[PDB]
Amino acid sequence: EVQLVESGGGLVQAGGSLRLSCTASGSINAIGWYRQAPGEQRELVVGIRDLGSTRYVDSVKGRFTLSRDNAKNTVYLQMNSLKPDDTAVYYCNAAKSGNRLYPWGQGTLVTVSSEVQLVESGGGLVQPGGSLRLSCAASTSTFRLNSIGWFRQAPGKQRELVATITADDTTAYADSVKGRFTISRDNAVNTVNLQMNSLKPEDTATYYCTARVFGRDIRGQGTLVTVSS
């Protein structure tokens, strides 16, 4: 028979990332990931159509990415932009139609935490392919939020504008992050965020927050984001 075992889960915050891996010895194409918490019976998160496609639950489509390496009898599931509601234990038995369920692994656990001037946060170190979430508090006691934008800068190089959101909720991203980055407001708390998926060694920079208030343009001190594994 097969012995399944899965590892790589951990504690992480809003946004954030984690690479779950899984492995077996004793067809690796028929493996998908289940998820279980207490108080609601376990569900399926990723499965396989008979033809060989990889169908993902709509609640997560656009975050979790099933990869595989036949050469190591290993399957993975790269998680980005992790939400609190992703908290549970993930298993690794099969998910193609018409296949026997393999012997249950123990499961790796996955937990997810949570003079006007601006205040950035969230910056940290991650691996290539990871995901962060930066936030931009204004420190005003809700005096004015306005229209903002995020610009980064590696040391000794010219600044780069990455993404912006105006008052009208229009978004524009640079071609250097096209597809990967996503700027959302979250207005209910007077803070504005930037989700950063699929990072590279090339994003290693100090990320700041500009707002252009009355008269002068303003920024915050900005947080490091490093990616070199």
Numbering used by the authors: 1 to 26, 30 to 117, 128 to 242
Q: What did the authors write?
A:
These bispecific VHH molecules, referred to as surrogate cytokine agonists (SCAs), create unique cytokine signals that can be tuned by linker engineering.
IL-18 SCAs DR3085 and DR3087 both adopt a conformation in which the two VHHs are in an antiparallel orientation with the C-terminal VHH shifted upwards relative to the N-terminal VHH. This offset places the interaction interface towards the VHH C-terminal side and increases the distance between the CDRs. The VHH–VHH interface of DR3085 is relatively small, with a total buried surface area (BSA) of 578 Å2, and comprises small hydrophilic (serine, asparagine) and glycine residues that engage in sidechain-sidechain and sidechain-backbone hydrogen bonding. Consistent with the screening data, DR3085 drove the highest maximum IFNγ secretion, followed by DR3097 and 3087 (21%, 15%, and 8% of the IL-18 maximum signal, respectively), while EC50 values ranged from 0.01 nM of DR3097 to 0.7 and 1.8 nM of DR3085 and DR3087, respectively. The other two SCAs, DR3085 and DR3097, were screened with linker lengths up to 20 residues and showed maximal activity with the original 10-residue linker.
